[PDB]
Amino acid sequence: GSHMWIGVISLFPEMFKAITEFGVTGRAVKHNLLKVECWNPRDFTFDKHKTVDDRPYGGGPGMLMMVQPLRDAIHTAKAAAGEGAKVIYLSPQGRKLDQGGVTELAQNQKLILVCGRYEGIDERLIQTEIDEEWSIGDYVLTGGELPAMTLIDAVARFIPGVLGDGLLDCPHYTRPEVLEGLTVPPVLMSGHHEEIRKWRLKQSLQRTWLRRPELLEGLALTDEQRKLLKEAQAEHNS
Amino acid sequence: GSHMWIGVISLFPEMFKAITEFGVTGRAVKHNLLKVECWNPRDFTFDKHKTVDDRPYGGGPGMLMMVQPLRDAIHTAKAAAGEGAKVIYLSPQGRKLDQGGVTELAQNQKLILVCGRYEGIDERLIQTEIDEEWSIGDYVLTGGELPAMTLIDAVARFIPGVLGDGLLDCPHYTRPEVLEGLTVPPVLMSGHHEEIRKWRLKQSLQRTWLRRPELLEGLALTDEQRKLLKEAQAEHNS
Ligand SMILES: Nc1nonc1C(=O)NCc1ccc(Cl)cc1
Ligand SMILES: Nc1nonc1C(=O)NCc1ccc(Cl)cc1
């Protein structure tokens, strides 16, 4: 129904087997809920050695992706996608991805993801070919493929059929009842669904406050959430 | 010399071919600068169907990783690593990764990365087996493998031999001189190394100010950087 098509431009398309052949995303691909289609700039070269990098104007230690093979690969992906495809470039200079941004990106039925390698791509290609630039985090990687796969994995979770409040998750427990002397909180064994719900919510509120208090600032807590957070803060202060 | 060993606990170890077989990280592995060794909890099961998940106490829609196979895999990885290995769990509840955190993690000669699947792992395993919990970003993925590979890629860049100031990168240009009517900034063609350096720095300062002004707050700018940022802000205000 709400299946998603993702075109990828990458010098290493075989990396994408990590998401198309395994786990939840692998299942999504097999079931046609997600399609990932790759184009490799190396296939758009014409010289004997299939050159895909080029020297930066102004000098410097690094190389950039060569414009012509990359541009031709992007154009081919765009032609395959048809109308309505948003072209995304992954880099540390982009908009910071968070779950809200994931949900925004997931509204697209078609995306094209451009994966950089080496020390950059020509700025004029960003101006002329790229719709949006996004970053998965404030760290530097060797290429855009892992960020692209990260984005695909995150948006895939919103496609209906793929899976079976601003707070961190609560602790979870499974067998055995006692592990290294540590027991399961009795509330989780009580079978009281309402008590269990409130315990889990209180724990999420407490953990968010202690570990990521800035996340709480962005929330308008419900009356119930205000109460449970206040209880948690009181207990923390003994 | 400063080679790094990374042990990985994962239900899908073949995903890690994405970093061990391709690009800069692939080269690092071939050259013995980086070693990535995987253990699969499925191999530590004893039942006929090799069960690796289990039901959460207190109920709920999800499953957790089964404790015994996961615990045994972690212990085996620890035994292989010997003394000094830091055990890392990847999840959205962890410390937010940034380049500074990458450089901190890169000081370790040995890491063990635990990759979760399903809806969590038992909290008591985090308490008893995990040294540090880290997040690659405020979004939710289907498993910890992509975050683990992201971390590996980022820290690998600091291993000497693997590769050939708090600001966003500047624009880069390569051939052709004119692309879709857009020309290369004449300064980059001038061959004046000092003018080129200052242009690039000014551009990084301008881009950081416009796109990520909060990053500037964390910096103590040099006199030169203060001057170039002021120039950029003046030109932006016409
Ligand atoms: N952080 C991030 N969020 O998205 N992408 C990144 C990142 O570091 N990419 C590496 C990269 C990106 C472009 C080129 Cl040309 C080379 C390497
Ligand atoms: N964000 C992040 N930063 O590190 N990891 C993540 C993440 O979403 N992992 C998915 C995940 C983690 C543990 C388990 Cl049990 C299941 C799924």
From Swiss-Prot, chains A, B:
Reactions it catalyzes: guanosine(37) in tRNA + S-adenosyl-L-methionine = N(1)-methylguanosine(37) in tRNA + S-adenosyl-L-homocysteine + H(+)
Binding sites annotated in the UniProt record for S-adenosyl-L-methionine: 89, 116, 136-141
EC number: 2.1.1.228
CDD domains, per the entry: TrmD-like
GO cellular component terms listed in the entry, alphabetical order: cytosol
S-adenosyl-L-methionine as UniProt keyword: yes
Taxonomic superkingdom: Bacteria
GO term, biological process aspect, one: tRNA N1-guanine methylation
Compartments (UniProt record): Cytoplasm
Keywords (A to Z) from UniProt: Cytoplasm, Methyltransferase, S-adenosyl-L-methionine, Transferase, tRNA processing
Keyword Phosphoprotein: no
Example GO molecular function: tRNA (guanine(37)-N1)-methyltransferase activity
Matches recorded under InterPro entries: Alpha/beta_knot_MTases, tRNA_m1G_MeTrfase_C_sf, tRNA_m1G_MeTrfase_TrmD, tRNA_m1G_MTases_N, tRNA_MeTrfase_TRMD/TRM10
Entries under Pfam families matching the protein: tRNA_m1G_MT
Function, in words: Specifically methylates guanosine-37 in various tRNAs.
Subunit structure, as described in the record: Homodimer.
Family, per entry: Belongs to the RNA methyltransferase TrmD family.
Name of the protein in its database record: tRNA (guanine-N(1)-)-methyltransferase
Native organism: Haemophilus influenzae (strain ATCC 51907 / DSM 11121 / KW20 / Rd)
Lineage, uppermost ranks: Bacteria, Pseudomonadati, Pseudomonadota, Gammaproteobacteria, Pasteurellales
